[PDB]
Amino acid sequence: VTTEQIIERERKLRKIAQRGVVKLFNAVRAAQLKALEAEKAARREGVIGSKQKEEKVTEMSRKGFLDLIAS
């Protein structure tokens, strides 16, 4: 009797691991895709060809985009 309820408790947080995978999959993906739209924003902004400037702001944008979806 006790055995076969476990499978629908097993399936129950089977689905929890799905939600965690779903969470990180789009949290990373929205971190890249919004940064690329922020990447072309610098090409239309006027940053003077300086790799340190278009990497720090490029990185700092990625920090915000991952933080916004998670919280």
Next chain:
Amino acid sequence: VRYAATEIAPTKSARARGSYLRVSFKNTRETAQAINGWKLQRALTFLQNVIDKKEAVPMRRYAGSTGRTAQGKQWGVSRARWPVKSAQFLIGLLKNAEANADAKGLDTGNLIIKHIQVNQAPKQRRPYMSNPCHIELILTEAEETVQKSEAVVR
């Protein structure tokens, strides 16, 4: 009379200089010869890989027997090392010339390093002597060729 090869136009060029750099002259000369005549993006990846101990710099003229790795198969030289400070000074000089080219309105994805040159800086007067160096470098766009019209008979 003879005419020397004229300079490529300054508005197609980009210059950068580094003077009195506290970095070894023998090492920087060997590092600059590795990337002479490369693409800009090719050089920035190579010099960053030297920083991360991934790809080695061959030693040809000021060559010391230090390491014999398989990474020298891509150069044909059996002596190799990892100049870290020489890569860092040359990276900041190449990034400076990339910013200069963008101020002058040049295509970022098509600069080549046609000129790199390492001289010697004055010695730092302390029995032990340091060997600093001067570095200058010039980037230009790749030479663009256009089509000729068909000649007209008249």
Next chain:
Amino acid sequence: ETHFAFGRVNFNDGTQLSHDLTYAKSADSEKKKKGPSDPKSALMQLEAKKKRLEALPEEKRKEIEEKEQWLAARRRAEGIKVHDDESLLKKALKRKEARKKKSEREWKERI
């Protein structure tokens, strides 16, 4: 509910975020997280900690040792090496001037 902590995430400069993916810490701040490197300087750090441990009452002493052992355990969990065993410190201090004395014999012979 859940909280869903995940694995380590880094971006380009060593800034690890968190388990909660809420805040962040700097890799430069992670460099003060690491301790001293010189073996002599490690000895005066443990000696000064012991000396400041002595000028203390018994009740506070246990809370010092309880949180310091768990700190060093947490410190070494991330990857920062915690050199806090005294007997290893003078062992490392013994072999360092062993290298100094060996090199002194060779270079005096060279002169």
Next chain:
Amino acid sequence: PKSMVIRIGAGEVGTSVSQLCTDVRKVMEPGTASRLKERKANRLRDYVTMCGPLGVTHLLLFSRSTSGNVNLRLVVAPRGPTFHFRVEKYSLTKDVRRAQRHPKGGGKEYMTPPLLVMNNFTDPKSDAHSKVPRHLESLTTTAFQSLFPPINPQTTPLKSIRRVLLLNRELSPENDGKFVVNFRHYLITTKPVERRAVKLVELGPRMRLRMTKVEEGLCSGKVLWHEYVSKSK
């Protein structure tokens, strides 16, 4: 971020948990020595001396008592904390394959290091002076966080990440005033419905582990936390 899982009970651990040791090995690839021959010789001094030269950062150890009771010893190398576990219930990766209607054999999915998720670890109410305090859940979370390589939002392709490992604390049942974890492993199967759904195929093994203790060093040092025995000050 490498590791080495070892049957520390030599070869006398038995065939049941010898297969289990290969299961948690073949899960934890590629940062593990798949060709590791755990001989009936050797002891802790032999593995932790070599581990620095081989660049091994964590060690998961498997020991069986005289009572047949199985324990898992997770220790940060080379003098770090050891995380003593107790195996309550278990099932081999083969056993998951029999119950599954369509097992999925290993393809390219077992060469990429997986995704670690944590559930119900730390935070909920606890207490600074609880039975299982907040300053212990933090140590356990950084233990398994450091056990895997970092994921980078910029460079790591999402096509690469194809496995997920579930570890959840059982604070769901009120009779668990103690640290009990459930370890499962899943294969990320992406179906584009762009809308894409992720479905997880189970792989195993299925661990029900309970913290017995935590010690400062390699099977030595002062025990920081015991569930059963509380040492007086």
Next chain:
RNA sequence: GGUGAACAGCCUCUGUGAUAGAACAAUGUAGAUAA
């Protein structure tokens, strides 16, 4: 009030010592001690 639960933070002045990362804190080895 002046680190003492801490997925924290560790400021400034001050003249005795130390190249740094990896190598378990190289690995360790032997002999002694009215402990």
